[PDB]
mmCIF file of all heavy atoms in Angstrom:
data_model
loop_
_atom_site.group_PDB
_atom_site.id
_atom_site.type_symbol
_atom_site.label_atom_id
_atom_site.label_comp_id
_atom_site.label_asym_id
_atom_site.label_seq_id
_atom_site.Cartn_x
_atom_site.Cartn_y
_atom_site.Cartn_z
ATOM 1 N N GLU A 890 -23.232 79.845 86.942
ATOM 2 C CA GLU A 890 -22.839 80.405 85.654
ATOM 3 C C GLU A 890 -21.351 80.736 85.667
ATOM 4 O O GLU A 890 -20.631 80.441 84.713
ATOM 5 C CB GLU A 890 -23.647 81.672 85.360
ATOM 6 C CG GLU A 890 -25.138 81.429 85.160
ATOM 7 C CD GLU A 890 -25.429 80.546 83.957
ATOM 8 O OE1 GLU A 890 -25.066 80.941 82.828
ATOM 9 O OE2 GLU A 890 -26.021 79.459 84.137
ATOM 10 N N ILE A 891 -20.896 81.350 86.756
ATOM 11 C CA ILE A 891 -19.492 81.716 86.899
ATOM 12 C C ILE A 891 -18.628 80.458 86.888
ATOM 13 O O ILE A 891 -17.620 80.395 86.187
ATOM 14 C CB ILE A 891 -19.241 82.480 88.221
ATOM 15 C CG1 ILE A 891 -20.019 83.800 88.221
ATOM 16 C CG2 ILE A 891 -17.752 82.743 88.399
ATOM 17 C CD1 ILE A 891 -19.610 84.763 87.121
ATOM 18 N N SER A 892 -19.034 79.458 87.665
ATOM 19 C CA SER A 892 -18.296 78.202 87.746
ATOM 20 C C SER A 892 -18.046 77.590 86.373
ATOM 21 O O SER A 892 -17.054 76.892 86.177
ATOM 22 C CB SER A 892 -19.046 77.197 88.626
ATOM 23 O OG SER A 892 -19.024 77.594 89.987
ATOM 24 N N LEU A 893 -18.944 77.849 85.429
ATOM 25 C CA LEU A 893 -18.799 77.314 84.079
ATOM 26 C C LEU A 893 -17.643 77.977 83.333
ATOM 27 O O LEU A 893 -16.940 77.334 82.552
ATOM 28 C CB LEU A 893 -20.094 77.513 83.286
ATOM 29 C CG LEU A 893 -21.331 76.735 83.741
ATOM 30 C CD1 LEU A 893 -22.529 77.120 82.878
ATOM 31 C CD2 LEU A 893 -21.061 75.240 83.641
ATOM 32 N N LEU A 894 -17.448 79.267 83.582
ATOM 33 C CA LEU A 894 -16.383 80.021 82.928
ATOM 34 C C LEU A 894 -14.993 79.513 83.294
ATOM 35 O O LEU A 894 -14.015 79.811 82.609
ATOM 36 C CB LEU A 894 -16.504 81.505 83.280
ATOM 37 C CG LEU A 894 -17.802 82.188 82.835
ATOM 38 C CD1 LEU A 894 -17.813 83.633 83.320
ATOM 39 C CD2 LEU A 894 -17.920 82.136 81.318
ATOM 40 N N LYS A 895 -14.903 78.744 84.371
ATOM 41 C CA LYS A 895 -13.622 78.206 84.799
ATOM 42 C C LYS A 895 -13.075 77.238 83.750
ATOM 43 O O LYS A 895 -11.874 76.991 83.692
ATOM 44 C CB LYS A 895 -13.770 77.477 86.137
ATOM 45 C CG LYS A 895 -14.391 78.315 87.245
ATOM 46 C CD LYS A 895 -14.573 77.509 88.529
ATOM 47 C CE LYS A 895 -13.242 77.190 89.191
ATOM 48 N NZ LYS A 895 -12.365 76.305 88.376
ATOM 49 N N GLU A 896 -13.961 76.696 82.919
ATOM 50 C CA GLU A 896 -13.555 75.741 81.889
ATOM 51 C C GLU A 896 -13.287 76.372 80.525
ATOM 52 O O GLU A 896 -12.864 75.692 79.593
ATOM 53 C CB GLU A 896 -14.618 74.644 81.757
ATOM 54 C CG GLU A 896 -14.474 73.507 82.770
ATOM 55 C CD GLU A 896 -14.197 73.998 84.182
ATOM 56 O OE1 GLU A 896 -15.056 74.706 84.752
ATOM 57 O OE2 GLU A 896 -13.115 73.677 84.722
ATOM 58 N N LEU A 897 -13.516 77.674 80.422
ATOM 59 C CA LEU A 897 -13.314 78.412 79.176
ATOM 60 C C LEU A 897 -11.847 78.839 79.026
ATOM 61 O O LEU A 897 -11.511 80.001 79.267
ATOM 62 C CB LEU A 897 -14.225 79.640 79.196
ATOM 63 C CG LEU A 897 -14.474 80.429 77.916
ATOM 64 C CD1 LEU A 897 -15.193 79.550 76.902
ATOM 65 C CD2 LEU A 897 -15.302 81.657 78.251
ATOM 66 N N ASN A 898 -10.985 77.909 78.607
ATOM 67 C CA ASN A 898 -9.552 78.180 78.458
ATOM 68 C C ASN A 898 -9.041 78.403 77.021
ATOM 69 O O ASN A 898 -9.276 77.590 76.126
ATOM 70 C CB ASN A 898 -8.770 77.051 79.138
ATOM 71 C CG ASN A 898 -9.257 76.780 80.565
ATOM 72 O OD1 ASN A 898 -9.240 77.666 81.425
ATOM 73 N ND2 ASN A 898 -9.704 75.553 80.815
ATOM 74 N N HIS A 899 -8.325 79.513 76.821
ATOM 75 C CA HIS A 899 -7.780 79.904 75.519
ATOM 76 C C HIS A 899 -6.609 80.876 75.755
ATOM 77 O O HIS A 899 -6.635 81.655 76.709
ATOM 78 C CB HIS A 899 -8.897 80.575 74.688
ATOM 79 C CG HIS A 899 -8.481 80.964 73.303
ATOM 80 N ND1 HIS A 899 -7.750 82.102 73.039
ATOM 81 C CD2 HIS A 899 -8.669 80.352 72.109
ATOM 82 C CE1 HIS A 899 -7.504 82.175 71.744
ATOM 83 N NE2 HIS A 899 -8.050 81.126 71.156
ATOM 84 N N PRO A 900 -5.574 80.848 74.895
ATOM 85 C CA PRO A 900 -4.424 81.742 75.067
ATOM 86 C C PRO A 900 -4.716 83.235 75.136
ATOM 87 O O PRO A 900 -3.933 83.995 75.708
ATOM 88 C CB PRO A 900 -3.519 81.395 73.878
ATOM 89 C CG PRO A 900 -4.462 80.806 72.863
ATOM 90 C CD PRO A 900 -5.385 79.979 73.717
ATOM 91 N N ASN A 901 -5.837 83.648 74.558
ATOM 92 C CA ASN A 901 -6.187 85.064 74.545
ATOM 93 C C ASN A 901 -7.339 85.427 75.465
ATOM 94 O O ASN A 901 -8.004 86.448 75.254
ATOM 95 C CB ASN A 901 -6.472 85.504 73.114
ATOM 96 C CG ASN A 901 -5.269 85.275 72.209
ATOM 97 O OD1 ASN A 901 -5.280 84.395 71.339
ATOM 98 N ND2 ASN A 901 -4.218 86.056 72.429
ATOM 99 N N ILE A 902 -7.554 84.594 76.481
ATOM 100 C CA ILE A 902 -8.593 84.819 77.483
ATOM 101 C C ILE A 902 -7.949 84.680 78.856
ATOM 102 O O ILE A 902 -7.299 83.666 79.133
ATOM 103 C CB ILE A 902 -9.731 83.773 77.380
ATOM 104 C CG1 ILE A 902 -10.400 83.861 76.006
ATOM 105 C CG2 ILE A 902 -10.738 83.983 78.519
ATOM 106 C CD1 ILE A 902 -11.515 82.850 75.818
ATOM 107 N N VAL A 903 -8.114 85.685 79.716
ATOM 108 C CA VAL A 903 -7.534 85.626 81.060
ATOM 109 C C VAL A 903 -8.162 84.460 81.834
ATOM 110 O O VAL A 903 -9.373 84.402 82.000
ATOM 111 C CB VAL A 903 -7.776 86.962 81.831
ATOM 112 C CG1 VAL A 903 -7.288 86.832 83.272
ATOM 113 C CG2 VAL A 903 -7.036 88.108 81.118
ATOM 114 N N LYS A 904 -7.337 83.544 82.332
ATOM 115 C CA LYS A 904 -7.859 82.380 83.035
ATOM 116 C C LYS A 904 -8.511 82.660 84.383
ATOM 117 O O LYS A 904 -7.954 83.373 85.219
ATOM 118 C CB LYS A 904 -6.742 81.345 83.230
ATOM 119 C CG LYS A 904 -7.162 80.094 83.998
ATOM 120 C CD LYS A 904 -6.041 79.056 83.961
ATOM 121 C CE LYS A 904 -6.471 77.721 84.554
ATOM 122 N NZ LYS A 904 -5.385 76.702 84.438
ATOM 123 N N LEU A 905 -9.710 82.107 84.579
ATOM 124 C CA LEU A 905 -10.402 82.234 85.858
ATOM 125 C C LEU A 905 -9.943 80.974 86.604
ATOM 126 O O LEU A 905 -10.350 79.858 86.272
ATOM 127 C CB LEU A 905 -11.920 82.230 85.665
ATOM 128 C CG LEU A 905 -12.726 82.045 86.959
ATOM 129 C CD1 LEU A 905 -12.460 83.195 87.920
ATOM 130 C CD2 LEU A 905 -14.195 81.957 86.613
ATOM 131 N N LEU A 906 -9.076 81.167 87.591
ATOM 132 C CA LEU A 906 -8.505 80.068 88.359
ATOM 133 C C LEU A 906 -9.435 79.484 89.407
ATOM 134 O O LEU A 906 -9.493 78.263 89.583
ATOM 135 C CB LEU A 906 -7.205 80.540 89.016
ATOM 136 C CG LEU A 906 -6.176 81.131 88.047
ATOM 137 C CD1 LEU A 906 -5.051 81.789 88.821
ATOM 138 C CD2 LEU A 906 -5.637 80.043 87.127
ATOM 139 N N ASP A 907 -10.163 80.348 90.098
ATOM 140 C CA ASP A 907 -11.071 79.890 91.137
ATOM 141 C C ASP A 907 -12.192 80.839 91.470
ATOM 142 O O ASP A 907 -12.096 82.049 91.261
ATOM 143 C CB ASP A 907 -10.298 79.588 92.420
ATOM 144 C CG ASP A 907 -9.952 78.126 92.555
ATOM 145 O OD1 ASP A 907 -10.892 77.295 92.497
ATOM 146 O OD2 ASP A 907 -8.753 77.813 92.718
ATOM 147 N N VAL A 908 -13.268 80.263 91.991
ATOM 148 C CA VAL A 908 -14.436 81.016 92.417
ATOM 149 C C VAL A 908 -14.665 80.576 93.861
ATOM 150 O O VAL A 908 -14.827 79.384 94.136
ATOM 151 C CB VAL A 908 -15.677 80.686 91.555
ATOM 152 C CG1 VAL A 908 -15.918 79.187 91.527
ATOM 153 C CG2 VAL A 908 -16.890 81.406 92.099
ATOM 154 N N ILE A 909 -14.650 81.536 94.778
ATOM 155 C CA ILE A 909 -14.825 81.241 96.196
ATOM 156 C C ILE A 909 -16.008 81.996 96.783
ATOM 157 O O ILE A 909 -16.037 83.222 96.788
ATOM 158 C CB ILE A 909 -13.545 81.598 96.971
ATOM 159 C CG1 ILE A 909 -12.349 80.903 96.317
ATOM 160 C CG2 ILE A 909 -13.664 81.155 98.417
ATOM 161 C CD1 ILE A 909 -11.016 81.501 96.680
ATOM 162 N N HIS A 910 -16.983 81.247 97.288
ATOM 163 C CA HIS A 910 -18.189 81.827 97.865
ATOM 164 C C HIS A 910 -18.088 82.022 99.380
ATOM 165 O O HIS A 910 -18.688 82.946 99.928
ATOM 166 C CB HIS A 910 -19.387 80.930 97.532
ATOM 167 C CG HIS A 910 -20.715 81.566 97.795
ATOM 168 N ND1 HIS A 910 -21.905 80.886 97.638
ATOM 169 C CD2 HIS A 910 -21.046 82.817 98.190
ATOM 170 C CE1 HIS A 910 -22.910 81.694 97.925
ATOM 171 N NE2 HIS A 910 -22.417 82.870 98.263
ATOM 172 N N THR A 911 -17.323 81.159 100.045
ATOM 173 C CA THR A 911 -17.135 81.220 101.500
ATOM 174 C C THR A 911 -17.248 82.632 102.074
ATOM 175 O O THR A 911 -16.806 83.600 101.456
ATOM 176 C CB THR A 911 -15.757 80.663 101.918
ATOM 177 O OG1 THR A 911 -14.722 81.506 101.396
ATOM 178 C CG2 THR A 911 -15.569 79.245 101.396
ATOM 179 N N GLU A 912 -17.831 82.734 103.265
ATOM 180 C CA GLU A 912 -18.014 84.018 103.938
ATOM 181 C C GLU A 912 -19.098 84.833 103.239
ATOM 182 O O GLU A 912 -19.452 85.925 103.686
ATOM 183 C CB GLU A 912 -16.701 84.810 103.943
ATOM 184 C CG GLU A 912 -15.526 84.075 104.572
ATOM 185 C CD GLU A 912 -14.219 84.839 104.437
ATOM 186 O OE1 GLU A 912 -14.143 85.986 104.927
ATOM 187 O OE2 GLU A 912 -13.268 84.290 103.841
ATOM 188 N N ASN A 913 -19.617 84.290 102.141
ATOM 189 C CA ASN A 913 -20.657 84.946 101.354
ATOM 190 C C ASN A 913 -20.167 86.280 100.801
ATOM 191 O O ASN A 913 -20.916 87.259 100.742
ATOM 192 C CB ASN A 913 -21.915 85.162 102.199
ATOM 193 C CG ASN A 913 -22.495 83.862 102.724
ATOM 194 O OD1 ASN A 913 -22.754 82.928 101.959
ATOM 195 N ND2 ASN A 913 -22.704 83.795 104.035
ATOM 196 N N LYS A 914 -18.901 86.307 100.397
ATOM 197 C CA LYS A 914 -18.291 87.508 99.839
ATOM 198 C C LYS A 914 -18.125 87.371 98.331
ATOM 199 O O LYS A 914 -18.228 88.352 97.595
ATOM 200 C CB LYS A 914 -16.920 87.749 100.477
ATOM 201 C CG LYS A 914 -16.936 88.622 101.726
ATOM 202 C CD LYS A 914 -17.193 90.081 101.370
ATOM 203 C CE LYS A 914 -17.037 90.985 102.583
ATOM 204 N NZ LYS A 914 -17.256 92.421 102.242
ATOM 205 N N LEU A 915 -17.868 86.146 97.882
ATOM 206 C CA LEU A 915 -17.658 85.851 96.465
ATOM 207 C C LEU A 915 -16.374 86.482 95.928
ATOM 208 O O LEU A 915 -16.317 87.676 95.644
ATOM 209 C CB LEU A 915 -18.838 86.332 95.619
ATOM 210 C CG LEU A 915 -18.729 85.901 94.155
ATOM 211 C CD1 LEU A 915 -18.747 84.386 94.078
ATOM 212 C CD2 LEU A 915 -19.871 86.490 93.349
ATOM 213 N N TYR A 916 -15.343 85.662 95.792
ATOM 214 C CA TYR A 916 -14.058 86.127 95.288
ATOM 215 C C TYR A 916 -13.771 85.416 93.985
ATOM 216 O O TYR A 916 -14.041 84.228 93.850
ATOM 217 C CB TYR A 916 -12.937 85.787 96.268
ATOM 218 C CG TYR A 916 -13.061 86.446 97.618
ATOM 219 C CD1 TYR A 916 -13.450 85.712 98.736
ATOM 220 C CD2 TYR A 916 -12.782 87.803 97.780
ATOM 221 C CE1 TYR A 916 -13.556 86.312 99.989
ATOM 222 C CE2 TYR A 916 -12.886 88.414 99.030
ATOM 223 C CZ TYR A 916 -13.271 87.663 100.128
ATOM 224 O OH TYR A 916 -13.361 88.261 101.366
ATOM 225 N N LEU A 917 -13.220 86.143 93.023
ATOM 226 C CA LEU A 917 -12.853 85.534 91.754
ATOM 227 C C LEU A 917 -11.337 85.620 91.709
ATOM 228 O O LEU A 917 -10.771 86.681 91.959
ATOM 229 C CB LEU A 917 -13.472 86.298 90.578
ATOM 230 C CG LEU A 917 -15.003 86.368 90.583
ATOM 231 C CD1 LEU A 917 -15.490 87.179 89.384
ATOM 232 C CD2 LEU A 917 -15.575 84.950 90.573
ATOM 233 N N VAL A 918 -10.679 84.497 91.441
ATOM 234 C CA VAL A 918 -9.224 84.493 91.363
ATOM 235 C C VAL A 918 -8.831 84.343 89.893
ATOM 236 O O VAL A 918 -9.196 83.365 89.243
ATOM 237 C CB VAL A 918 -8.600 83.334 92.168
ATOM 238 C CG1 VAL A 918 -7.085 83.522 92.222
ATOM 239 C CG2 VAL A 918 -9.174 83.301 93.586
#
């Protein structure tokens, strides 16, 4: 679900650059 938000681009929406699961910590950039 999160990975899908990476494609939701608009000037008034903060861009989700990356989603990292590694280490099983889950980081959102």
Side-chain angles (χ1 to χ4, degrees):
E890 294 297 299
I891 297 298
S892 290
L893 293 177
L894 299 177
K895 305 177 70 296
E896 276 45 62
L897 194 64
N898 310 301
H899 183 281
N901 301 110
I902 299 179
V903 174
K904 178 172 187 177
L905 167 62
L906 305 170
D907 264 305
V908 53
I909 307 161
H910 193 184
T911 65
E912 304 175 59
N913 300 307
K914 269 287 187 179
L915 187 62
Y916 297 106
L917 300 179
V918 189

